[PDB]
Amino acid sequence: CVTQLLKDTCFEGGDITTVFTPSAKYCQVVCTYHPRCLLFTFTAESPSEDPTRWFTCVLKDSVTETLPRVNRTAAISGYSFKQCSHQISACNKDIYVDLDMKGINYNSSVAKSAQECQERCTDDVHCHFFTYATRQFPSLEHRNICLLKHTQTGTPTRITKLDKVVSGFSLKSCALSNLACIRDIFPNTVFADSNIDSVMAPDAFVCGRICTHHPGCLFFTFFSQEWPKESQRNLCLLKTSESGLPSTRIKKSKALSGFSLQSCRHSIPVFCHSSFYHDTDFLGEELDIVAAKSHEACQKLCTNAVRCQFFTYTPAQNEGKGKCYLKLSSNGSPTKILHGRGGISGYTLRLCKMDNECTTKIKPRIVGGTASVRGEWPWQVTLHTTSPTQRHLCGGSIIGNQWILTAAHCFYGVESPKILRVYSGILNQSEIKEDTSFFGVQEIIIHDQYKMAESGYDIALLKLETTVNYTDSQRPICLPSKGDRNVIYTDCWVTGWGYDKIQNTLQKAKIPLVTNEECQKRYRGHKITHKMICAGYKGDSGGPLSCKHNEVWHLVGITSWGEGCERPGVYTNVVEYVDWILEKTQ
Amino acid sequence: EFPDFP
Numbered sequence: 001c002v003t004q005l006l007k008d009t010c011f012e013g014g015d016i017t018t019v020f021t022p023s024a025k026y027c028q029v030v031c032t033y034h035p036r037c038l039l040f041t042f043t044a045e046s047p048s049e050d051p052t053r054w055f056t057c058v059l060k061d062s063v064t065e066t067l068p069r070v071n072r073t074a075a076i077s078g079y080s081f082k083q084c085s086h087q088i089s090a091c092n093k094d095i096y097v098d099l100d101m102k103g104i105n106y107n108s109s110v111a112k113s114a115q116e117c118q119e120r121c122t123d124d125v126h127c128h129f130f131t132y133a134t135r136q137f138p139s140l141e142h143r144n145i146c147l148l149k150h151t152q153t154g155t156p157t158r159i160t161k162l163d164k165v166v167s168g169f170s171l172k173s174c175a176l177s178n179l180a181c182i183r184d185i186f187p188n189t190v191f192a193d194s195n196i197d198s199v200m201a202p203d204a205f206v207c208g209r210i211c212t213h214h215p216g217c218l219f220f221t222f223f224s225q226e227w228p229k230e231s232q233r234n235l236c237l238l239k240t241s242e243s244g245l246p247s248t249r250i251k252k253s254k255a256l257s258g259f260s261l262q263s264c265r266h267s268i269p270v271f272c273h274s275s276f277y278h279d280t281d282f283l284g285e286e287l288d289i290v291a292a293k294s295h296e297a298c299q300k301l302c303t304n305a306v307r308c309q310f311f312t313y314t315p316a317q318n319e320g321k322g323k324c325y326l327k328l329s330s331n332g333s334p335t336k337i338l339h340g341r342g343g344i345s346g347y348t349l350r351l352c353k354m355d356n357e358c359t360t361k362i363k364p365r366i367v368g369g370t371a372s373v374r375g376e377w378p379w380q381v382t383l384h385t386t387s388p389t390q391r392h393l394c395g396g397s398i399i400g401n402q403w404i405l406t407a408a409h410c411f412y413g414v415e416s417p418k419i420l421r422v423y424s425g426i427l428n429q430s431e432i433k434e435d436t437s438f439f440g441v442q443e444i445i446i447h448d449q450y451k452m453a454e455s456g457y458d459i460a461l462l463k464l465e466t467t468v469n470y471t472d473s474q475r476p477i478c479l480p481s482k483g484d485r486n487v488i489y490t491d492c493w494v495t496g497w498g499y500d501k502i503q504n505t506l507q508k509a510k511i512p513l514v515t516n517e518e519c520q521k522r523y524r525g526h527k528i529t530h531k532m533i534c535a536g537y538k539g540d541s542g543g544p545l546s547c548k549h550n551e552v553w554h555l556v557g558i559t560s561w562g563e564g565c566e567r568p569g570v571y572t573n574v575v576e577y578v579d580w581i582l583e584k585t586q
Numbered sequence: 587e588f589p590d591f592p
């Protein structure tokens with residue numbers, strides 16, 4: 001796949017739509033995230049072009065998967081990332097100087113800095129992008145005003161150059177917002193506000209996932225197949241309101257209603273619908289039809305064909321070989337969803353690469369009841385020290401390609417990172433021998449303000465000097481989302497070995513959370529801050545507190561003190577350190 | 587709507 005761009009190159013035709021982007025590199029992101037775009041042509045600021053034709057990003061489709069290139073000055077082009085194995089995000093931290101990006105202007109408050117303006121935009125239910133007038137702006141009336149904006153697409157309706165002004169996008173898709181996600185799905189209720197769009201969805205999960213990446217969608221209603229009107233089954237209405245809430249909730253039956261989750265975006269799957277839909281046919285434009293032994297082999301053929309967005313498989317239910325119908329549409333979605341014709345339908349997985357990797361499903365493999373195996377806790381790592389001889393020191397969790405999150409108190413009088421050894425996918429400590437490969441820590445990032453474990457600011461990062469080939473034995477866990485502050489985890493689990501006395505096999509044990517208030521009582525002499533969380537009634541220092549929520553695993557806490565294997569253990573409150581982790585990693 | 591910048 002062709003990630004780089006093209007100095008002065010234009011693609012001829014394909015014109016699907018035309019939008020305004022602040023740069024080619026971001027135009028490439030739009031292209032990637034659009035359900036039909038393969039390639040694009042962006043117009044830069046230049047002598048050569050009328051000011052109106054600038055900042056123009058033209059998304060295109062070709063059947064051959066390329067178009068004819070034409071040497072043209074000021075033009076940058078132009079392939080989407082759909083063809084790539086690399087992960088991809090829509091996070092754009094760029095601030096755009098002397099640049100005014102246009103849309104519906106809706107708050108017009110006054111602000112300290114470009115930064116605090118961006119923060120406001122990110123924290124607001126409606127904000128797609130902002131413009132900020134610097135101290136240095138002419139009109140004294142206007143200088144320092146931070147006006148927020150939205151459009152139908154999320155991109156500006158126009159872009160103009162204007163001196164002493166700075167523009168930028170919401171950073172919700174950098175996991176930076178503190179906007180609370182509402183996960184509640186209201187059944188037998190409908191919503192009645194504006195109707196900004198609609199697709200055909202097979203279930204309300206899909207429906208609400210589409211509400212999530214649709215920029216103008218704040219909430220939704222799904223009319224299930226069991227609805228009255230024929231014309232309205234599987235209809236996913238995408239809604240919004242001036243306030244941002246649904247005004248009213250009607251009892252109105254066979255319909256589910258929910259909210260966007262743009263805020264908890266990473267940590268939840270969005271683009272990845274791995275599920276199959278049985279006796280279900282997805283209507284759309286046919287692209288190929290091929291012999292296929294399983295409906296799985298159908299998916300793999302859809303996923304492998306870049307233009308394919310979804311498929312139906314027809315089982316011989318004969319000679320064994322099914323017909324696999326690879327399909328596409330205008331948005332990413334069937335034009336009609338039909339039941340009762342014997343097909344198996346789903347979607348391309350070419351879309352999962354956009355989802356955050358710690359959201360991939362878990363296998364199924366064993367419940368053990370007491371002890372672990374093969375690939376049960378692919379994020380849990382054992383931390384070895386070479387002094388005085390080689391021993392287990394801490395538990396850690398994989399949270400990045402290159403990163404471990406763990407306790408600071410773990411690194412007491414460690415002088416150099418060069419004494420450390422991280423091992424992944426380990427069960428029996430027995431399994432570690434000199435030949436055994438390990439990751440070497442490049443760097444230790446202890447929190448400044450850390451003094452004592454019971455003082456609480458107890459959190460460390462290991463930058464590994466070589467990255468992790470992700471496997472069934474070595475995958476990350478997800479950080480809790482700032483939107484999810486009000487979440488009530490009820491499926492929480494401590495893992496580790498013993499750390500004193502150490503167990504050979506990886507110990508696993510499900511534990512209940514315990515409220516801060518409640519813990520504070522049991523803990524006489526020491527203060528329990530909001531930057532800690534508690535639990536109890538069998539793991540190491542730095543070991544993870546992992547909670548499963550909606551079949552996705554979160555790193556809720558890191559081990560810090562505790563008494564005694566009955567009083568609850570104290571933990572570092574990972575959510576409260578999210579700005580921090582993101583800061584120190586990007 | 588608010589008017590935008592001059």
Ligand SMILES: *[C@@H]1O[C@H](CO)[C@@H](O)[C@H](O)[C@H]1NC(C)=O
Nearest residue numbers: 373427428429430431504505
């Ligand atoms: C560690 O290895 C296996 C599990 O993979 C276990 O059955 C065995 O007893 C352990 N070895 C010991 C205690 O020597």
Ligand SMILES: *[C@H]1O[C@H](CO)[C@@H](O)[C@H](O)[C@H]1NC(C)=O
Nearest residue numbers: 006007008009069070071072
């Ligand atoms: C466009 O022009 C010529 C001939 O088409 C060729 O050298 C090249 O493909 C393009 N770029 C430059 C820089 O000449």
Ligand SMILES: *[C@H]1O[C@H](CO)[C@@H](O)[C@H](O)[C@H]1NC(C)=O
Nearest residue numbers: 106107108109120123124125
């Ligand atoms: C933007 O303006 C509103 C009133 O329009 C004001 O109360 C607030 O300080 C600003 N927005 C927030 C906190 O979202």
